[model samples]
Target chain A: DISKLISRGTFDQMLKHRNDGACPAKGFYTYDAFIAAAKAFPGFGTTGDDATRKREIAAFLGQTSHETTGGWASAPDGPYSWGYCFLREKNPSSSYCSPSPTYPCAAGKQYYGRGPIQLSWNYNYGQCGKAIGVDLLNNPDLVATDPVISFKTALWFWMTPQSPKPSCHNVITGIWKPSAADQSAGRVAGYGATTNIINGGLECGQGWKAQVEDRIGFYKRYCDIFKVGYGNNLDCYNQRPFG
Target chain B: DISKLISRGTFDQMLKHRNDGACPAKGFYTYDAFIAAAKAFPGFGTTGDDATRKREIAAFLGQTSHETTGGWASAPDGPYSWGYCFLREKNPSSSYCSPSPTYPCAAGKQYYGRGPIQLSWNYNYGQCGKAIGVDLLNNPDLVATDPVISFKTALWFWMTPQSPKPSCHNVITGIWKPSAADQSAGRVAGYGATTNIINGGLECGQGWKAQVEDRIGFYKRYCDIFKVGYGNNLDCYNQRPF
Candidate 1:
């Protein structure tokens, strides 16, 4: 079903640079891996009509690309070339373990960050597993070691809401509209809101942060590749990141 | 090993941010790549006295770092922390092919900037490959693939002279005495001269280009950490490129 929205040719073309030498995860993310992973999660890449379905994939891939991208402004093949570059955060200073009992800490195992979205913290891994029925709380490494599970985890995060904030999928589609609190936070519809959902507390409302720009860059490029127009509210410069 | 000139720990600290999310070549340029590449080309990162050796590597990295950096003024770990962020030129507009037969361009292969220096143009790759025995004219991608080769190519560019202008190595090492023509152009005997050699033709003598300032930022930081004073003539705002 997901294949109908994104064919192998288009997906491959979109991710052609994922395995460039500069990328940390070169030769790691393959078409078969992605397709196989997408198959595990139904209604994942297809949310709305044909165009909406395409845009959802674009938006989702855009965030993941920023998380994993290694391309810079002067990098070859333009700024948006290398997405899916680094699969995990390198040299994390902390174990990313939290004390929240809902997501009990896995003894000796660190949850710093791993996967396309670079999923971090113990609570995040717990939430991911609970939604996907995998007990990721104890085995966060599965997101990094298994290619199929890696993308599956990323999609789970995109589709599952953390409350106070909606799922990135809901924001990208027309399903989730902002509340009064979200409006004060400048959380509007479109890609901007999706960013707030992803990592607004840490990166948003920072005013022209390089990290945010990198995400927008990927989105714009994917829009071009998919021949879809980039909807309005592309950035969260004025919006307060969701706390 | 490069540890002779610079401690491995110090080099690793300086390049700690090369794998940040915003960096273009995350996990591409590593401590091993620099050490191994510096080995292929001697007298580079090891020229002059011990202090000079350190300064030369500092200056070279500063220039190349500026080319690849992605940090803004507000970036974490400061803007200079983002050096070595990109390994190649992003979004190349053209193939940078020259009509000169002496360094014939390859067919269908583009010669946009690549590596630490973000080396560009067909001629630079052709000449560097010829000198290093890498046949870069046909395989420019080697600079991106081989860590040692990547650093070797950057060193070759810095040490080799393009005439009319001296090599960055000569300018930094005090071996290049500014000529009358150079003086007329306001070229001095310090970092500014090296900048002119690298990108002076376009960036130099421009009153206050952001790009030039970024390069100066890297040099200043490296000098402070290397425990060397930043030599005089830090800017070429008053000088013309060779």
Candidate 2:
């Protein structure tokens, strides 16, 4: 959803730098035709007009841009940041460059990422393929060679509503912010989403304050502009308070 | 698979009547597109490489043509005819479209074709949407406007194997002409693969012809080919023998 916001800008810019563009994955453009490919998204196949989706999409764009484009401004790789992101959609089927520590996949293919973000492991391809129709059993490349198709898939996960992760709205409306949580989070309102990735309204990923805050800032911008209320203060990204 | 087998002249012959301007749907000309579609099944993405799969696909296709399409020379309007036969894919998604009897679907929606044949219904919108990278749930007309994608959806079902309907291959390759028992049936199979219009299969309530035959067929083609008589003996189509 957020991808739509960021992409509405010069997606061509990012398209130009897909894949690590270095060693083993050099010269790989995520999209096939750029402008033509943008046409395939059209609010990424949801609904409403461009004006409406742009806000939420902005939040998504900001997050994925950080993950996909570069690892938050602070990370050494910067712009090469790919959070819970799956790289199969950006690499050859054989390339298992995911950095996730464990594989939660059932198909034994690859699960490049997990948790609140899309971090992929070596075991999520077959399952993701089944969802996106690539017969992951047959062609894992479908997830890689087809960016438009892959984007829709990632969208499917994001927009599903019932997913185990936080919604784009939750992220943007700042519902995930600890302030949105009741002071007695332990007993009162449970902060499911924000609690997992953070503590007391701040990023907890490890030495990436700016990176996390930027995400919060983007979320704040979206909610502020859209006048949308923070929905479901429950723990979406899993933020259980620490003693 | 057979379309490739069709002679160049025969191919052009079918292609000639591509429109209703000249000859209409009748005999071989009738539903030639449907027949061609049925014949075009490439067999579970596996037929392209393995020679054994090529044979397995051939036999399965041949069996399906005889069972679903016209065998030798079945008359029009018969279940044995293509465009005449219709079954639904397994596990129809209620989230796609309302399971209305009428379809081409709305603009963006899909339904499951639950029958022995896995025919396209108001539900393919959702299925094809995921496959070809379009919001099928929003653009239902693609089923009509885009013949290639639409048929690819059908062919996708038509070419899937018989085991595990949720696996996608169970979309097509349903039905059974393998035996007289398979020739009469109605009802869903494992994981909700249904068939209201009888093609060549029986009901689970009756003899479970469709169910048993499908199981038998998979093992026969795949397992047996590998020199492992893995499938149990069941009447073709898994229908009532009597």
Candidate 3:
């Protein structure tokens, strides 16, 4: 079980900076909530060998940490240490509500990113809610207000596959094999592929972006904590986003 | 004259980091080229009091430094010191050439950003070339090569005004007053106003952007070197773009 892999002590230790008194997400994301959410997706962190499992868990945490980070270049304990610092996107320029035929927008609901993965847009909320049996299309606030639900929504995003993009879980656990198109586009089986699956449209294929570096920094720190070697192809700097 | 306001010693001292051996533009941009370019626009740094002239010169360098900067947070002597590090935009996604009636694209020329302010677009080249008595439409490479012409193009951009935006020179030298609409939009006479005049469309009105902060860092450093107080409204954080 994930409990054996990541004890409450270990979880707290890894996220010490996040739980610091200065962080906005302090006292909000509990270790218990994370474990409880992982239980729903048994296939997660259990697909391969012990090393693979730990690496996958570390990768997920790393990506989530980056999405919610409040760190800067000069932050205390360095920048990568401070993650899970924000619960929602700040100063969002738009309401993030796009017209969807299958999942219409909920009236008066603003779906600007929230929770660990920062679930965004009307379509994603509709799909995630349907998969997790939690009408998030109508109650997107639950992703921010309830700790367990917040973690669950994040896990759903990590494990589930959307069209044209494989699940981050599949990419990390060696379950995803790149097709000819993926190979030609430089999408291989590694940490970089998982990033390509996440927000590659904006962050990938660009040479040396600060945001991409920030994500890599978190993953490297977590892998160090787990005593695992960082695999090859650690960056999607050359890979094209899945169109 | 601009030479009186900014002597050769002051010019070299002000741009010490830019002329460092490690910088890409180390030997390319010299004080002699800068003074020769400033000669074309007689009113450039000589429009106001000594303090105003110094401030204007510092502000111009600050904005231009930011456009071609190669610095980061942990860079040597801080991020703002590494100015004039690149001569052109790197890995530009598009050619930046657009269909314009007045300034049509040259048959095979690509009008990507080049020179001190990283002057971009086909229209800017066409306009600047006409004003400076050069044909940049067919020879945009001059902006990258030929240091005197490159500096002249940058000075031309600084001195000339586009409609709806005052010249950065006028704004910095206290010659341009804010219109009632400008005041309503939070456009005041300060360094912030100069930024608005330069590239307010992208960099202004956004609260606490990294690029905006980098510009302010350069300005503050130059002002310190000149022993001058940074005037009011140094940031365009709350101001709307022109």
Q: Give me the overall lDDT of model 3.
A: 0.81
TM-score of each: 0.54, 0.30, 0.54
Angstrom error of the Cα, residue A157, model 3: value is 1.3
State the fraction of real interface contacts model 3 keeps: 0.00
Candidate 3: segments with Cα more than 4 A from true spot: B1-242
Better of 2 and 3 by DockQ: 3
For lDDT, the strongest prediction is: 3
Candidate 1 lDDT over A13-80, as tens digits, reads: 77778776446577778777777877776667677777777788888888888888766566677667
Question: What is the clash count for each candidate, in the order shown?
Answer: 11, 74, 0
Candidate 2 per-residue C-alpha lDDT over A1-243 given as tens digits, one digit per residue, 9 for 90 to 100: 434344433344322334332211233334333234335444442344454355445344445443433232343333333232334222111134344444232332433332223334344554455555555434444444555554544554444333333534454334333343334343123222433322323333223343455454434444444454333343322233233
Displacement of residue A225 (Cα, Å) in model 3 is 1.7
Best by TM-score: 3
Which CAPRI tier for candidate 2? incorrect
Looking at model 2, residue A44 earns an lDDT score of 43
DockQ head-to-head 1 vs 2, winner: 1
Off by more than 4 A, model 2 = A1-9, A13-52, A71-108, A113-127, A137-141, A162-166, A169-211, A214-243, B1-242
Q: What is the interface RMSD of candidate 1, in Å?
A: 18.8
Error of model 3, residue B158, in angstroms: 19
